Amino acid sequence: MSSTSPNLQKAIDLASKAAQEDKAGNYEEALQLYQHAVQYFLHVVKYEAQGDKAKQSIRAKCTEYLDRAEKLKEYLKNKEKKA
């Protein structure tokens, strides 16, 4: 078995904390964590070397985190429209 790059480890940690913060209802913190996770996942997949299977899993996680993140942006826009 093989090595997880430090940038890719950053991506997973951030995502992990995003998920935690998401479920806790701290949506503003969650959103930032998701966004930065995606930033690292994109960097890794583009400029670090990995197999097809690795790229395919990163693409998958990228999709999920941007989905949720965008949904949180829209939520926060409407929470803010209140005032």
Partner: peptide, 13 residues
């Protein structure tokens, strides 16, 4: 090809 994700990530700022 990761353009769509890159496009969506950039917009998300």
């Amino acid at each position: 090809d990761f353009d769509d994700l890159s496009r969506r990530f950039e917009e998300l700022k």
